[PDB]
Amino acid sequence: PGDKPPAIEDSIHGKYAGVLFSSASSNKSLNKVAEDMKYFNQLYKESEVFKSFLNNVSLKRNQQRDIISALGKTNFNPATNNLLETLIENKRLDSLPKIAEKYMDYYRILNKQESITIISAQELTAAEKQKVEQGLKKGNANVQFTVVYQVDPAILGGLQMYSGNNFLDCSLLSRVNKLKTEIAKISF
């Protein structure tokens, strides 16, 4: 997709993840590295020793290299192996988790599927929810999506949709405030 990550950032983990995304997407593969990075994230939180190993800084470079090999020398894309070697050489191994997370983020941005959250005061009847799906479809009409619901507002009879990074307010509470403000400014 133009060998260009979604975003460019100067942070340590951001810099490495962008290079990995570019390099990976360059040769052929991104999904393979995604599983590798996803595996590291799950392991970083599930295995206590692995977390202590990464954070450990008194460890020598050769020692870090041997332990990584013991983990696994295969089932990791060559880019991932080269990335680990570079991190060991640059003493950046401690930041390996963040990189992983960050990478998946970018990957999840490339994912077309998105989750839409609707906020309404009144409980949404199943029949009403089906109508809402029809409206969201007709609005997009070209992308499949998963819907989520949430009802604990102060607004009433209003719908507010959150879609990843966009917010659309159809709440009646907004209408109430707007009218009370404009009526005040009549300047009769």
């Binding site: 942070s11 340590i12 810099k15 962008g18 990995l20 390099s23 040769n27 880019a79 640059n90």
Partner: protein
């Protein structure tokens, strides 16, 4: 930490690719940043402190800072 000027995206990308080609790293350098008449150069190992270096255009520079990952050079001319 914050970052290291030697961790350029282009240099890092080569490591990730796995191709060990440095185009004669010793006695040759690639500019990484230029500002206010100071150029940081990755590579260019085997360069003595206070030595003259020639840029692609023809202007010379003086290697004053020999750092781990780069060389801070002062350009002897217009930047």
């Amino acid at each position: 930490k914050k970052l290291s000027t030697g961790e350029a995206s282009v240099v890092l990308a080569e490591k990730i690719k796995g191709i060990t080609q440095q185009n004669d790293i010793t006695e040759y350098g690639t500019v990484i940043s230029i500002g206010d008449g100071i150029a940081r150069v990755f590579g260019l190992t085997k360069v003595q402190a206070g030595e003259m270096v020639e840029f692609k255009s023809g202007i010379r520079g003086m290697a004053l800072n020999l750092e781990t990952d780069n060389v801070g050079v002062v350009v002897l001319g217009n930047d």
